[PDB]
């Protein structure tokens, strides 16, 4: 048997391997701590090794020996760099985004909010703003313009029909879903398993794209899992909980040693919840990109419903050469002025003309 499955090392030093449902299932197999010490591995690594059939009164098979780990030999597993020691940089490998299917919205995304590899941005909108629809659009854009990169999408606490529509419409890309139907412990389990596996893949020098759904309601999911809050951060946040969103989020970084980890996700804002505002403010100082989205623009059905002025990037030069840097500088000195609504319709008209470069040309 080929064992595609990632280490869920339980409390007592033995592990599990979840299935394609991306949750605790039948094909879990024990991962003894002795093998952990032997291989100098981290949990969540793609491990393949000979497994013997379970015997009478014996429930989960014991890993005799790992032959190919991460499709690699054991010695590489024993001697491989540690992730946290890698040098983070600013994103230098920008991601070009031109789409025929929606030239307007995605081209607005590109010309306004350029994306690089290792990017840790946050797009924000109130509930019922199609943030999932924008996720779909950008996912297809990446699958078209940059098919080389591994695209992964995680959905939390959402409607099942939307999940089915996405999965049918995503065309086989790795889509992870955890609806609000599921109990929250399942939510957090799946989220953290994806976290560790992605960490392993980046640790193997990969370009890992993680598209997380709605970090804010994910934060509510944590609070539902996370009992105490300690003292109540106003309305029921939690320091140690959000650290797991914090660790999951700040892990995104541009690494000078090859590979990259770009994770993008959305936030629910203007919900009347001080908690949502606090999470937005807290991760606002963490991400290097923000894409605000105005509700009344969506009321006008104008997509994308971006709050352009609040939107922006850090190190505009570090994704854009000095000529592109200065031309973007001029373009911001230009577009920093004109009024939002008219901005959206008449920019829709002006970018309806030609390609992004052609429009600039």
């Amino acid at each position: 048997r080929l064992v595609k499955g990632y280490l869920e090392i339980s409390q007592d030093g033995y592990g599990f391997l979840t299935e394609n449902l991306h949750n605790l299932e039948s094909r879990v197999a024990i991962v003894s701590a002795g093998l952990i010490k032997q291989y100098a591995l981290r949990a969540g690594d793609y491990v393949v090794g000979q497994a013997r059939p379970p015997r009478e009164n014996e429930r989960y098979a014991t890993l005799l020996k790992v032959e190919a780990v991460n499709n690699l030999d054991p010695e590489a597993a024993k001697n491989r760099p540690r992730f946290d020691e890698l040098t983070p940089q600013f994103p230098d490998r920008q991601i070009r985004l031109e789409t025929t299917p929606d030239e307007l919205s995605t081209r607005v995304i590109d010309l306004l909010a350029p994306i690089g590899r290792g990017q840790r941005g946050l797009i924000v909108a109130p509930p019922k703003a199609g943030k999932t629809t924008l996720l779909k659009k950008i996912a297809n854009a990446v699958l078209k313009n940059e098919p080389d990169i591994k695209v992964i999408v995680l959905l939390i606490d959402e409607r099942p029909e939307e999940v089915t529509d996405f999965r049918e419409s995503v065309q086989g890309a790795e889509v992870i879903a955890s609806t609000f139907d599921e109990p929250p412990q399942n939510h957090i389990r799946v989220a953290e398993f994806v976290h560790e596996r992605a960490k392993r893949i980046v640790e193997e020098g990969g370009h890992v794209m993680i598209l997380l759904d709605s970090i804010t309601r994910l934060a509510r999911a944590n609070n539902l899992v996370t009992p105490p809050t300690g003292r109540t951060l106003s309305g029921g946040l939690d320091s140690a909980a959000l650290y797991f969103p914090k660790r999951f989020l700040g892990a995104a970084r541009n690494i000078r040693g090859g590979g990259s980890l770009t994770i993008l996700a959305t936030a629910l804002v203007e919900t009347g919840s001080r908690m949502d505002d606090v999470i937005f403010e807290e991760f606002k100082g963490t991400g290097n990109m923000e894409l605000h989205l105005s509700r009344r623009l969506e009321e006008r059905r104008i997509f994308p419903a971006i709050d352009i002025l609040k939107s922006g990037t850090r190190r505009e030069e570090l994704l854009l050469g000095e000529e592109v840097t200065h031309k973007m500088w001029l373009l911001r000195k230009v577009l920093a002025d004109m009024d939002p609504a008219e901005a959206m319709e008449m920019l829709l008209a002006r970018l309806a003309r030609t390609k992004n470069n052609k429009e600039f040309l």
Partner: protein, 49 residues
């Protein structure tokens, strides 16, 4: 611009062309704003040209 067909050369209307009330005779352009023009139309023409 549709009625501009009678305005052939630069500003001056072509000789021998019949004119009705409400039709352009000379196309004169002033500045949009006394001290500051419209940022809307200014940025319009800025990113077109």
């Amino acid at each position: 611009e549709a009625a501009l067909r009678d305005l052939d050369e630069e500003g001056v209307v072509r000789i021998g062309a019949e004119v009705k009330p409400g039709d352009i005779l000379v196309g004169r352009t002033s500045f949009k704003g006394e001290s500051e023009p419209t940022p809307e139309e200014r940025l319009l023409r800025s990113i077109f040209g």
